[PDB]
Design a protein around this ligand. Structure first.
Ligand SMILES: *[C@@H]1O[C@H](CO)[C@@H](O[C@@H]2O[C@H](CO)[C@@H](O)[C@H](O)[C@H]2NC(C)=O)[C@H](O)[C@H]1NC(C)=O
Ligand SMILES: *[C@@H]1O[C@H](CO)[C@@H](O[C@@H]2O[C@H](CO)[C@@H](O)[C@H](O)[C@H]2NC(C)=O)[C@H](O)[C@H]1NC(C)=O
Ligand SMILES: *[C@@H]1O[C@H](CO)[C@@H](O[C@@H]2O[C@H](CO)[C@@H](O)[C@H](O)[C@H]2NC(C)=O)[C@H](O)[C@H]1NC(C)=O
Ligand SMILES: *[C@@H]1O[C@H](CO)[C@@H](O[C@@H]2O[C@H](CO)[C@@H](O)[C@H](O)[C@H]2NC(C)=O)[C@H](O)[C@H]1NC(C)=O
Ligand SMILES: *[C@@H]1O[C@H](CO)[C@@H](O[C@@H]2O[C@H](CO)[C@@H](O)[C@H](O)[C@H]2NC(C)=O)[C@H](O)[C@H]1NC(C)=O
Ligand SMILES: *[C@@H]1O[C@H](CO)[C@@H](O)[C@H](O)[C@H]1NC(C)=O
Ligand SMILES: *[C@@H]1O[C@H](CO)[C@@H](O)[C@H](O)[C@H]1NC(C)=O
Ligand SMILES: *[C@@H]1O[C@H](CO)[C@@H](O)[C@H](O)[C@H]1NC(C)=O
Ligand SMILES: *[C@@H]1O[C@H](CO)[C@@H](O)[C@H](O)[C@H]1NC(C)=O
Ligand SMILES: *[C@@H]1O[C@H](CO)[C@@H](O)[C@H](O)[C@H]1NC(C)=O
Ligand SMILES: *[C@@H]1O[C@H](CO)[C@@H](O)[C@H](O)[C@H]1NC(C)=O
Ligand SMILES: *[C@@H]1O[C@H](CO)[C@@H](O)[C@H](O)[C@H]1NC(C)=O
Ligand SMILES: *[C@@H]1O[C@H](CO)[C@@H](O)[C@H](O)[C@H]1NC(C)=O
Ligand SMILES: *[C@@H]1O[C@H](CO)[C@@H](O)[C@H](O)[C@H]1NC(C)=O
Ligand SMILES: *[C@@H]1O[C@H](CO)[C@@H](O)[C@H](O)[C@H]1NC(C)=O
Lengths: 207, 122, 207, 207, 207, 207, 122, 122, 122, 122
C-alpha cells in the first residue's frame, strides 16, 4: 500500500527536534494567521478576554516530500504532535493557567512538503477594559503570538490577515475588525530578536 | 533514491584510477544521501565514502581519505566514486546504499540496504 | 491461545498514522451518529449547552481481518487509543477549554474489519438561547461534528439518525427531536471540502 | 532474588490487550462491588450526587500464576495501569467532565492468578432529587456500572453486595441502604447484550 | 564521568515494579511523616480541610548502593517518578477529585541505599467541622495515610512526628498541635492487614 | 544536514538524570531570575497572589558543546522537557493545586553549552494581606524559589535581579519594586543545606 | 498467509526458464505480501522479488530486474516467480516470506520468517 | 517449564521412527508452550514443531508436516516429538525451548533459549 | 563486581575434578550475580552455572547439573565453580560474567560482558 | 573526536615495548573517550583499554592490566596506548573508537565504530 510505504519512507532519519530547513543558515518562514469564530465572554472584572480561535500556521518541511507518481493516490499525509517539527507559537499575554490553551491536531503535509496546522482553542488573554464610556466604549484587546524559543534568525514569522467569515455575532459586543501587525522586539533574556504578530480584536459594546 | 545500483567495477593494476557509478531508481535522488561500502572476500562490510543529500557534506574512511573522492550529479541521478592510485587492499565488492536526507556520515543505522555490488580487483 | 496469536498477527506492519483504505484513491466511509442521554444544563447567561452524549463512529479497517475458523472463539478485538487509526471527529462549536470533551474508549473490531467506536462524554457547545418568549421559547442548539484534518477526498462522513431510546427527560426543557443533516463546507484554510454532520437539539422550555 | 525472577517471568509474552481467559470461548467472570465511604454532596440544583467510593473488581488472569515453592516469600505481585489487562468498567450515568472519575491504583495478583483491583474515587453521578416532600423526601440515586467494550459474551459481570462498614454519616442525609441489582440490556449500537450492575443509594433527608 | 557511570550501573536489571527488599519474606520498613506548612482553608459548608503539606517517606532500596571511593564525588542520586520503586501511600479521606493531590518530585538516594521522598501538595481532606461551640470550638481534622496495595506483610509503615517548625500561622484558626498515631486496620477487601498513620490537625478558631 | 548531525551527535551517551558538571565534586551554578509581566489578581479573602511570570534559569551543561565551524549555521539547539537535565526549581509557597504552575518550554543551548530556560506561567502564591490601612496598605508578597532535590552541595543557586521592563500597570495595585534575596536554609528532612531566592513583590494599593 | 512454502526448484542450464511456486497455508493469502529471497552456498540471504498483498506493487533486485517476474493468484493461494534466461549466479536456495499487508518492498523487517526453501542450480 | 531438556536421540536408518522426549524442570509445565528446533552441523537453527501450553495448537515445518507429530503429557511434565519415516536431512541436533503460555507458533521471539540438545543421525 | 576474571584452568584427564575461580575487581562483589559460560572453540557460547548475588539461587545446565557445583565467598570476593568427574565434552574456555543483583538465572540479557576466559582441556 | 585513526603498529619480538597512537579528526578530541579493541585473525573483537574524556578514568582488560598503559594528550589530539613486554597473544589488529563524553568503560554500547585498525605481530 502506497500510503503505508510513504509513511515508512517519510519517518526515515527524521528528527522532530530539528528545524526543517535545507541550509541551516536561513530562517524557516512560518506564516501565522487567525480565525476568530466567536467571543465567548469579555470579563471586565478579571480583565480577561475569552474567545474561540483557530490558529493557522503554514511552513515548508523539505523533509516530507514525495512524488505522487511513485505514491499514487497519496497527496497528503497527517502527523500527530511530537512526530514532526512544529513551531512553538504561544500567546504571550495568556491569562490561562495552562498558558498554552490550544488543542493539538494533526499537521497536514502535501507532496511539496507544505505543512499546515490549524489548532482550535478557547483562548483567555489579558485585556484592559475601560468602563469610562460605559455604553459607547471601544475596547482594543491585544492577542500577541510568537515563537518562544526561536528568534528571527531561526524562525521568520510572517503575518496573514485574520479570518472573519466564520465569526458569529456576539450578544453584547460588536466586532469592528481585527487588524494584525508584525513587530520584532528585543527582550532582556538574550540578544536574539523575537518577531511576533499581534491581532487587536477591537470590540464595541452593543446598545 | 530507494534503489541504488553500483556499476563500473573491473580489473585494474596497482596505481591505476577507477570511477564507480551509482544509479538511482524508485524515488527522488536529491532526497537521499549516498554511502559506499566494501565487503571483501573474507572480511566484514566497511564504510568507504559518503555524500550528503545536498552534496555539501562528505565522509571518507582513513585508508581512502586522500585517494578517493565522491561526487553527485542530479541530472543523471548518479553518484560517482572517483579512485586515484589503487592498492591491493582495495580489492573488494563495493555496494551503494541510500540514506533518506542523510548527512553523509559513516553511521550505519542511517543508511538503507545496499543493492548488489560490483567487484573491483587490484 | 488464539487471542494472543490474533493480536500479534493484527499488529504486524500496522501503522496507526495511515488511513486504513485498500486503494488510497477512494475515501474511507465513516458513519457518524449520536446518542443523547441527558440535557444536563442549558446556560442562558453563558450561551452554552451541556449534554451527555455517546458518539457512534463506524468504519472498515481492511487491515484488521481474520478467519474465525483459524482463530476459534475470537470474533471481536478491542484496541486502545493510539494503537489503531481513528477518525479525528471533533465538535466545531465546542465551548469546552479542552475542546475535545470526549472520553477515549476501546475501538471494537470484528472479523470483517468493521471498527465501531462509542466515546461517551459531557459536551459543552455554544448555543444562542433567545429569551424573547420567556415561557414558550423553542431553542435550536446546533452540534456540528466533522473530521479536522481529513476532507471529503479522504474521509467521507456519512450521517445516521441520533438515538433517543436512552434519553432521560430534563426538568426545565422538553426534547422535541434532534434532526441531523450532512453538509459539505469550504473553509479559507484550504481548497479541500470538509463534510460535517450537524444535530439540532431543539428543546422547549417546560411550563 | 525471587521477586525479580517472578516479575521477569510473568510478563513473558504477556499482552495487556488480550482478555486473560484460558479458552477464548467462555466469558471471563468479573465480580464487581462498591464501598461507600462518604456521601459528599447532594446537589439539588445541578441534579448531581457526589460520593466517595472504592470500587472492587475481582477476576482471574490465568496468565499470572506461579508456585510459591519456586518463588519463596512471593505470594502477591502488583501491576500498574497499562501493564496487565483490566476490565473497562465505567459509570454510565456519570456527570463528571472526565467521565471516568476513578483513580488508577495497582492490581493485586496472587499465585492462583486472582486479580484484585480497588480503585478509589470521588464519583459525580446524575440523580433526580424530588423536593416535593421537602422535609421527608426519600431519594433513590442510581449508580450504573458496566464494561464499555465487553458484552456478556466476553465479560460476565457479577454483582457482590456493597460495603457500608466504612460509611461516614452525613449531616443532611441519612443512608437507608445501597441495594444492588445485575441486569443485561441491549443497546442500539450493538447486538451483544451488555450486563450492568446498578447500586441505588436511597438516602433520606435528616430532620 | 563517575555520575554517568553510576547512573548506568544502577539502572542495570532494576525493576520499578519490585519491592526493593534483600529478602522477599521480610517487610520493607517505610518511615512516614508530615510537614504542615499552612492551613489554606477550612470549609465549614463543604466539610473539607485544605492544607499545604510536604510528605516525608524514607526507606531502603538495597539495590541502589555504591562505594563512594569507586564513584568519587557522587554521594547522592535522584530518580524521577516511574524509574524506581516508591511506596503507594495515599490519603484515604481525600476530598480531591484526583484523590492523589501530591506533586511527584525526585527520590533522593545516598550510597547506603536510603531513599527519601518529599512530595509537596495542597491536600483536600474530609473533616467534620462542628459549629455548636462556634466562637471557641476545637476541631479535630483527621489525615489518614497508608499504602493502597501493600499490607503489613509487605510494607511496614512506621510513623514519625509531624514537622511543625515551617508552619505559618493562620488568620481564623489557631493550631494547637498535630499528633499522629499508627494503627493496623482490617478491610472487607482482603484478609491482609493494612497499617496506616493518622495525623490530627486539632485547630482552634481564633478570637 | 549539519543541524541533523548535531542533534544525532549531542544525545550520544547523554543521560537526562545526570547533573551536567565536569567534576561531580563542585556544584553546578544555576542563575535564577524573574520577569513579572502583570499582577493578575490579589485575593485578600483567600490570601493568594496571582501573577504572570516568566522564570529565567541559566546554567552550563558541558555535554552539549560543538564547534560552529564543524557545524556551520548551527549556533543554537533546543531541547524539550525530559530530553536534557533541568534544574528542579519550584515555588515553595505555592497555593496552586498542581504546585508547579509553570509551562515547560524548550531549553536553549548555544555552542559553549550555556542552557537558558524561560518557562512562563500564572503563579498562585500564598501571601498575607493586611487590611489594617484599608486605602494605604503596602503589601509584601513573598515568592520563594529553589531546587527541591538538589542542595547547595550539588546546585549552587545564584540570584539575578528581576526584570520589570515588561510589566504592565495594574488597576487596583501599584508596584513599587520587586527586590530579591538569596538565602541558605536548613530543613528537618536532611542535613543538606538548601539555597533559595525570594522575590518580594511589594505592592501598594492605588487611590 | 502465515505459512509460505516454495516449490518447483531443480537443475537447469544457462539461458533456460524456470517457474517457482509458493503455496500459502495457515491464513488468508490475500492479506499478505510475498517476498522471495536467495541464499547461495557461501553467501548471505538476499532479496530477489516481492509482490504486494493486492499485487499492485512489485520490487525486484537489479540482477533479476529484467529477467524475473512475480505474480499472484488467489484462487490457488499461490505466488509465482517466473524466471527468464538464468545465469550461474542464480544457483541458490529460494525461500518465501509472508508480510502482513506488506507493500511488496525489499525491507526485511516487514517480512516474517522464511520457510524451507528449494534449491535451483544453473 | 523454565528448563526443558531433550532426550531420546540416537542413530537410526532411513524410514525408521524415532520418539524424542522433552522433560520439564524449574516451573509449572502446563504454563509453557514447547518448541522443537534443529541445528545441522553447518546450517542455521530452524523451527521444527511446536505445541501450545494447552495442546490445542500445533505448528510444523513443511518438511516434517506429514511425518512428525507433537504431543504433551502433564503427568510426566514431558513433551513428545514422534517421528515417522526419517530422511537423511533430518540428521541434526534437536533442542527444546519453552514459551510462557505460548500459542505453539513458529515465531522465535516468544521462546526462551534451548537447553542442550540431542543428536539424531539418519 | 564490574570486572570478573576467571582462573584455575588447565589440562585434566577424564573423570578428574577441577576448581575454577572468579575474582572480582572494580566494585562490590556482594551486589552482583556470577554466571559461567563455555565458548567451545568450534561452537557458540553456552550457559554453564550461575549463583545469585546472595548465593540463595543457583542455575545449572543439564549436562553439568549433577557434576558441577557453584559457590560464593565474599571474604576473598570470589566465585568458585567446582567440577566433579569431567568429560571430553567439557573441554572449552570458561568465562565469568557479572549481573547486577542478578537472580542467578541463565538469561543472557541479565549478565554483563564476560572477561577473558580460561581454557580447560579434558 | 568523530573520526579516530590508529597508527604505530608493526612487528615486534616477545618482551618488547610498543606505542600505538590514535589521532582525532572531525571534532573536539576533549569531548570523547577513547577505547581500544583487538580483532585477532580468527577471534572476535575484544576490549583492550579505555580512557575517559577527561583522562581521569581508565579501564583495562585483565590480560593487559599490568602491561598496557593508556594516556591522552589534547595538544596533538592523540591517545597513546603504551605496551610493555608483549606476548604472542598480543598479535592482532587494534582499532580505536570514540565515545561521546564516555566514562572510559568497557561497555560496547557507548563507543562509536572503530576506524581501520593497525596490525601488530609478536
Ligand atoms: C502544496 O501546497 C502548497 C501551498 O498550499 C502549494 O504551493 C503554492 O503555495 C502558494 C503559497 O505558499 C499558494 O498561494 C499556491 O496556491 C500554492 N499552489 C500553487 C499551484 O502555486 C503546492 O503546489 C502544493 N503541492 C502540491 C499540491 O503538490
Ligand atoms: C461485522 O460487523 C458489521 C457491522 O456490524 C457487519 O456488517 C454487516 O453489514 C452492514 C454493515 O456494513 C449491516 O447493516 C449488517 O447488519 C451487518 N451484519 C450482517 C449479518 O449483514 C459484518 O457482517 C460483521 N462481520 C462479522 C460478524 O463477521
Ligand atoms: C488467591 O486469592 C483468591 C481469592 O481471594 C483465592 O481463591 C479462594 O477461592 C475462591 C475463588 O475465587 C474465593 O472466592 C475465596 O475467597 C478464596 N479463598 C478461600 C479460602 O476460598 C485463592 O485461594 C488465593 N490463592 C492463594 C495461593 O492464596
Ligand atoms: C544515608 O542516609 C541515611 C539516612 O539519612 C543514613 O542512615 C543512618 O541510619 C538511620 C537509617 O538507617 C538514619 O536515621 C541515621 O540518621 C543515619 N545515621 C547517621 C546519619 O549517622 C546513612 O548512614 C546514609 N549513608 C551514607 C551517608 O553513606
Ligand atoms: C553562549 O551564551 C553565553 C551566555 O549567553 C555566553 O557567555 C558569555 O559570558 C557571560 C555568561 O557566562 C556573559 O556575561 C557574556 O555576555 C557571554 N557572551 C560573551 C560574548 O562573553 C557565551 O559566550 C555564548 N557562547 C557562544 C555564543 O558561542
Ligand atoms: C546558506 O545561507 C548562506 C547565507 O544565509 C549562504 O551564504 C549560503 O550560500 C547558503 N547555502 C546554500 C547551500 O544555499
Ligand atoms: C516523478 O516521477 C515521474 C516518473 O516517475 C518523473 O517523470 C518526474 O520527473 C518525477 N517528479 C520529480 C519532481 O522528480
Ligand atoms: C482506486 O480508485 C481509482 C479511482 O477512484 C480507480 O481508478 C482504481 O481502479 C481504484 N483501484 C482499485 C485497485 O480498485
Ligand atoms: C476460513 O477457513 C476455512 C477453512 O480453513 C475456509 O473454508 C474458508 O474459505 C475461510 N474463509 C475465507 C473468507 O477465506
Ligand atoms: C471452550 O468453550 C466451548 C464452548 O463454550 C467448549 O465447547 C470447549 O470445550 C471449551 N474448551 C475447553 C478447552 O474446555
Ligand atoms: C509446586 O512445587 C512443588 C515442589 O517443587 C510441587 O510438589 C508442587 O506440586 C508444585 N505445585 C503445583 C501446583 O504444581
Ligand atoms: C528471610 O525472612 C524469613 C522470615 O522473615 C526468614 O525465615 C529467612 O531465614 C530469611 N532469609 C534470609 C536469607 O535472611
Ligand atoms: C570501598 O572501596 C575501598 C577501596 O576500593 C575499600 O577499601 C572499601 O572496603 C570499599 N567499601 C566497601 C563497603 O566495600
Ligand atoms: C574536583 O573538585 C575537587 C574539590 O572540589 C578538587 O579537589 C578536584 O581537583 C576537582 N577536579 C578537577 C578535575 O578539577
Ligand atoms: C574549531 O575548528 C577549527 C577548524 O576546524 C579549529 O581551528 C578551532 O580550534 C576549533 N575550535 C575549538 C574550540 O577547538
Amino acid at each position: 500500500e502506497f500510503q503505508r510505504k510513504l509513511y515508512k519512507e517519510l519517518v526515515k532519519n527524521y528528527n522532530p527536534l530539528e528545524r526543517p530547513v535545507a541550509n541551516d543558515s536561513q530562517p524557516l518562514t512560518v506564516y501565522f494567521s487567525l480565525s476568530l469564530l466567536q467571543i465567548m465572554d469579555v470579563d471586565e472584572k478579571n480583565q480577561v478576554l475569552t474567545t474561540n480561535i483557530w490558529l493557522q500556521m503554514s511552513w515548508t518541511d523539505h523533509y516530507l516530500q514525495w512524488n505522487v507518481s511513485e505514491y499514487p493516490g497519496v497527496k497528503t499525509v497527517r502527523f500527530p504532535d511530537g512526530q514532526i517539527w512544529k513551531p512553538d507559537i504561544l500567546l504571550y499575554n495568556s491569562a490561562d493557567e495552562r498558558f498554552d490553551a490550544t488543542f493539538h491536531t494533526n499537521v497536514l503535509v502535501n507532496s511539496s512538503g507544505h505543512c499546515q496546522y490549524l489548532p482550535p482553542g478557547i483562548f483567555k488573554s489579558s485585556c484592559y477594559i475601560d468602563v469610562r464610556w460605559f455604553p459607547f466604549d471601544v475596547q482594543h484587546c491585544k492577542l500577541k503570538f510568537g515563537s518562544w524559543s526561536y528568534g528571527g534568525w531561526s524562525l521568520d514569522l510572517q503575518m496573514q490577515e485574520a479570518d472573519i467569515s466564520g465569526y458569529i455575532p456576539n450578544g453584547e459586543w460588536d466586532l469592528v475588525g481585527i487588524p494584525g501587525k508584525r513587530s520584532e522586539r528585543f527582550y532582556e533574556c538574550c540578544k536574539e530578536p523575537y518577531p511576533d504578530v499581534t491581532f487587536t480584536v477591537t470590540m464595541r459594546r452593543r446598545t | 533514491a530507494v534503489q541504488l545500483q553500483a556499476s563500473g567495477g573491473g580489473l585494474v593494476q596497482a596505481g591505476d584510477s577507477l570511477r564507480l557509478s551509482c544509479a538511482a531508481s524508485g524515488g527522488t535522488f536529491s532526497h537521499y544521501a549516498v554511502g559506499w561500502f566494501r565487503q571483501a572476500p573474507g572480511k566484514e562490510r566497511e564504510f568507504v565514502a559518503a555524500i550528503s543529500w545536498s552534496g555539501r557534506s562528505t565522509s571518507f574512511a582513513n585508508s581512502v581519505k586522500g585517494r578517493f573522492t565522491i561526487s553527485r550529479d542530479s541530472a543523471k541521478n548518479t553518484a560517482y566514486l572517483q579512485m586515484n592510485n589503487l592498492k591491493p587492499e582495495d580489492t573488494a565488492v563495493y555496494c551503494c546504499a541510500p540514506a533518506r536526507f542523510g548527512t553523509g556520515s559513516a553511521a550505519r543505522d542511517e543508511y538503507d540496504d545496499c543493492g548488489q555490488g560490483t567487484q573491483v580487483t587490484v
